Amino acid sequence: SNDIYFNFQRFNETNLILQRDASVSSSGQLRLTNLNGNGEPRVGSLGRAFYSAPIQIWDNTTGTVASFATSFTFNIQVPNNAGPADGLAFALVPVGSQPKDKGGFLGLFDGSNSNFHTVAVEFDTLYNKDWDPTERHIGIDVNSIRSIKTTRWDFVNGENAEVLITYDSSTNLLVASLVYPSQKTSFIVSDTVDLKSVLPEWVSVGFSATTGINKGNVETNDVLSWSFASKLS
Amino acid sequence: SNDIYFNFQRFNETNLILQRDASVSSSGQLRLTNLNGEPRVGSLGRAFYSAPIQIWDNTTGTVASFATSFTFNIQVPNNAGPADGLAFALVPVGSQPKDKGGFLGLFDGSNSNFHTVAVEFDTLYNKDWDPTERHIGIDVNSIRSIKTTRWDFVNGENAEVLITYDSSTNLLVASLVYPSQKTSFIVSDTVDLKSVLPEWVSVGFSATTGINKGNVETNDVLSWSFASKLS
Amino acid sequence: SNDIYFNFQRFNETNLILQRDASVSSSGQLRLTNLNNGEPRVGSLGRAFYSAPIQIWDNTTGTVASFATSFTFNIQVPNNAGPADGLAFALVPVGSQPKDKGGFLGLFDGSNSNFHTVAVEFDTLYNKDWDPTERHIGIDVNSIRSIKTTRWDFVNGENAEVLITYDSSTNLLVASLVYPSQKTSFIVSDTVDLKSVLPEWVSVGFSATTGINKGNVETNDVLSWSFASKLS
Amino acid sequence: SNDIYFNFQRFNETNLILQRDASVSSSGQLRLTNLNNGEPRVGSLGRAFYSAPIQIWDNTTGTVASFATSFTFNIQVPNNAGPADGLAFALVPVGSQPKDKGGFLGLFDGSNSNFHTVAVEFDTLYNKDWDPTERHIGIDVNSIRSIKTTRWDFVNGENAEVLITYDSSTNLLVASLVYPSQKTSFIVSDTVDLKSVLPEWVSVGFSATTGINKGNVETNDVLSWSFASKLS
Ligand SMILES: *[C@@H]1O[C@H](CO)[C@@H](O)[C@H](O)[C@H]1NC(C)=O
Ligand SMILES: *[C@@H]1O[C@H](CO)[C@@H](O)[C@H](O)[C@H]1NC(C)=O
Ligand SMILES: *[C@@H]1O[C@H](CO)[C@@H](O)[C@H](O)[C@H]1NC(C)=O
Ligand SMILES: *[C@@H]1O[C@H](CO)[C@@H](O)[C@H](O)[C@H]1NC(C)=O
Ligand SMILES: [Ca+2]
Ligand SMILES: [Ca+2]
Ligand SMILES: [Ca+2]
Ligand SMILES: [Ca+2]
Ligand SMILES: [Mn+2]
Ligand SMILES: [Mn+2]
Ligand SMILES: [Mn+2]
Ligand SMILES: [Mn+2]
């Protein structure tokens, strides 16, 4: 065991790494993207946030991988006469990792061919002809903005979504679920991912989000609480 | 806080209440229903953890949040069909078994308030109340699930269940996944535990096999873990 | 892992096994011993255990569980009276029934039956025959004659905070007590081999007695308890 | 709740802040002080902290966190040499840099700056000016002059198992230590008001030093550590 666990019911920037537009509000909410002052989601916003202590996801000397689980509550709000864009994602990234492309890339990817050593679970609110399925989806991305697998997600605007993602070392099973307590709806997706193959032994852990790059496609991307836990060996 | 938590990676009958055909194998598997190596017909078995759990408090008016997880394995013999199902249930303390088959051992079809809440894994259609397909369903005092979801039963594969109840939102959420098939199903609805359940309940499983020859399955739990936090 | 954990910040009799005078008050306090007019009854004996048996060790795997528990008790002696006889946390055989009163804390006999009992006592009365001269915290293994002890400065009516822990690897049993009000603290530690004395499964809880003679009585109350055991 | 918990059964420098001679060995042991031969270097000073700041209290809600930590350390003195200077677990301000060597354990100055530091020391050397006569475990609050202490029978080369806990309600700080090999144990407890001395956020870890004179040196190694804090 080489355990870690934390749980923030209110955020503070002192134990967080914030990149670009990410910020913690006076009410302790992690706000991944900008407001344009009219209280409106800024266009072309990109923000990432990670927990400040690196986590060891696997060990090359023992050949072991960690199991983990995380849960968070997010709220995405689209202003009137506008559409959702571009999405939000929880990600496991390399330690000094810097932001990538805006919009459809969720700040996590490039469309170039660099190995990003990134794994993420996205909550995609906008269709990208080139790789996205037709409907808003939850998706497991492994080194590409082209989800290795997905599930239809019925985006409800302004309602709090409760996510629960888990990875089991033995079965290599990654499983993401989401539920709208207000609507009583729920969605789940699961596929096997081999963390050792794509991820470095140590990674920073957190969120990434972007708003559409064109006028009428913007949404707020806020996380209200988060809890992570990882057990290695 | 008035917490409880346990986790059995292997069962033993000393801290379990077994009813009817329930039993723990030499390998530590909770086997809810009977068998010469073939699932017995008309089998009924229930098993609960021996210490009652306080689900809610009338004096403080509070309800507990909880979560449980278990791995079960249902196996249908060749040239036979699945029947009747398996359910995780919260039941009154001295609760005794009810009807066989389609009632999963939990209900009657009479009008007694059973003060029972359960999440069923139904493997057989019962014209009178079941949906057409095999489903995961949330039952609140009735074998007629208050809500359900299509479940693609895979025979002999281990299913990993995760049920959770959140006191604040009253949200009950059941999910299942076949690590082998990489499939997953989820259901969620609001249940008010205070309304139907007594403050203290025994916690566990119930299962039955079909009452007619060709409808039988084994109903085995391989591991279980429960957790409840009151106040 | 074959874990268990619980934590009662207020007792209720539904998940407890009460023996003799043990009882839970309307305020949810486990009261191990009686009253007669609101004064600790003489010759009282009360035991209380958590209702689900705990597996302390496994003969097939040869493993032993590590555990920890913590509770807050309060012993109060009435005016012009002396403390007696004591309170103890014990690991006992599953259907175990009470033993002798007074100095035996309800856990022992003075006969030579193997009681398969292990307990940590909080002794408030000197028993010439086996007790040390001063009030002590003691580790008892199958005998009311503690295998080891430490001076305990009993403060009357103040809440004591106990913390007992057993580590499988080192076989180290360690008991400590602190009076948050007085800022005092006491600790004892010795190695005990649970496999040698205890059965694989045991009931877990408390036992307490009041002196058998008029002016030796105290109340024996537990206010909160928390147990945790991890096997393998 | 704004919880945190971690547990390292083997150290790696990637989630640690190391200062001066602190280093993680190939075997994953946090070695707070240097060597040379393989002898403890004289005048060594090393500090190590967990990389994410912990919030110890909140000015807006006025709440303080309860916490607990446990670690196993091993201090070894070379033949024909004496222990010096000590080891300490400390809660320090976030960017905090090292202080004086030897007797100051790297945590203090002897000047009159508020160090906003709270530490539990395992002092192996008497310092006429402020130390008690015997080797002690002590609670330091802003000064190398422990606010309270307890005799500690240092056993050379044996693994010591420490357990420190802080309870927000009672403000009680309680440190204990046991040598599973010797079966000895020691405990100290006093009330400390974290809000009064500590900033809301602090880095958490260890500090240690070796004697500044030839014959006074020891190794200062931590073999495992686990911290836990619950705020509100
Ligand atoms: C986080 O805590 C620091 C403590 O100095 C405070 O200045 C800051 O305002 C807090 N941040 C938020 C978003 O409340
Ligand atoms: C239950 O534990 C007892 C301990 O004595 C053991 O004899 C028995 O074999 C165990 N039962 C099972 C089904 O493993
Ligand atoms: C225990 O809970 C039951 C719930 O029905 C209640 O009637 C009883 O008063 C409780 N006992 C105590 C001692 O509080
Ligand atoms: C810490 O992990 C890194 C991962 O790159 C490895 O190089 C290093 O050897 C590890 N340190 C120890 C002391 O094992
Ligand atoms: Ca998209
Ligand atoms: Ca049915
Ligand atoms: Ca005595
Ligand atoms: Ca000194
Ligand atoms: Mn997508
Ligand atoms: Mn049904
Ligand atoms: Mn004694
Ligand atoms: Mn000192």
PDB file of C-alpha atoms in Angstrom, chain A residues 1-10 12 14-15 51-54 202, chain D residues 1-10 12 14-15 50-53 201:
ATOM      1  CA  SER A   1       0.000   0.000   0.000  1.00  0.00           C
ATOM      2  CA  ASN A   2       1.128   3.485  -0.873  1.00  0.00           C
ATOM      3  CA  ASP A   3      -2.156   5.174  -0.472  1.00  0.00           C
ATOM      4  CA  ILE A   4      -3.520   8.651  -1.017  1.00  0.00           C
ATOM      5  CA  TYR A   5      -6.892  10.141  -0.517  1.00  0.00           C
ATOM      6  CA  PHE A   6      -8.344  13.548  -0.412  1.00  0.00           C
ATOM      7  CA  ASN A   7     -11.636  15.234  -0.506  1.00  0.00           C
ATOM      8  CA  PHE A   8     -12.436  18.854  -1.141  1.00  0.00           C
ATOM      9  CA  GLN A   9     -15.920  20.050  -0.417  1.00  0.00           C
ATOM     10  CA  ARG A  10     -14.740  23.549  -1.235  1.00  0.00           C
ATOM     11  CA  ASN A  12      -8.758  26.793  -2.404  1.00  0.00           C
ATOM     12  CA  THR A  14      -3.147  26.760  -2.407  1.00  0.00           C
ATOM     13  CA  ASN A  15      -3.032  23.018  -3.057  1.00  0.00           C
ATOM     14  CA  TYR A  51      -3.987  18.548  -7.347  1.00  0.00           C
ATOM     15  CA  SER A  52      -0.498  19.736  -6.377  1.00  0.00           C
ATOM     16  CA  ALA A  53       1.086  16.447  -5.230  1.00  0.00           C
ATOM     17  CA  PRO A  54       2.046  13.990  -8.014  1.00  0.00           C
ATOM     18  CA  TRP A 202       3.838   9.509 -11.805  1.00  0.00           C
TER      19      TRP A 202
ATOM     20  CA  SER D   1     -15.045  17.767   5.757  1.00  0.00           C
ATOM     21  CA  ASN D   2     -11.973  18.735   3.749  1.00  0.00           C
ATOM     22  CA  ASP D   3     -10.016  15.630   4.270  1.00  0.00           C
ATOM     23  CA  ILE D   4      -6.602  14.382   3.305  1.00  0.00           C
ATOM     24  CA  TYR D   5      -4.888  11.083   3.924  1.00  0.00           C
ATOM     25  CA  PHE D   6      -1.808   9.402   2.682  1.00  0.00           C
ATOM     26  CA  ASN D   7       0.397   6.564   3.583  1.00  0.00           C
ATOM     27  CA  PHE D   8       3.831   5.782   2.316  1.00  0.00           C
ATOM     28  CA  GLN D   9       5.269   2.390   3.048  1.00  0.00           C
ATOM     29  CA  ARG D  10       8.235   3.363   0.895  1.00  0.00           C
ATOM     30  CA  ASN D  12      10.120   8.423  -3.411  1.00  0.00           C
ATOM     31  CA  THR D  14       8.667  12.965  -6.389  1.00  0.00           C
ATOM     32  CA  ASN D  15       5.969  13.976  -3.916  1.00  0.00           C
ATOM     33  CA  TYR D  50       4.920  16.224   1.778  1.00  0.00           C
ATOM     34  CA  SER D  51       4.530  18.331  -1.373  1.00  0.00           C
ATOM     35  CA  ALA D  52       0.904  19.403  -1.043  1.00  0.00           C
ATOM     36  CA  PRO D  53       0.125  22.055   1.572  1.00  0.00           C
ATOM     37  CA  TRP D 201      -1.973  26.279   5.504  1.00  0.00           C
TER      38      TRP D 201
END
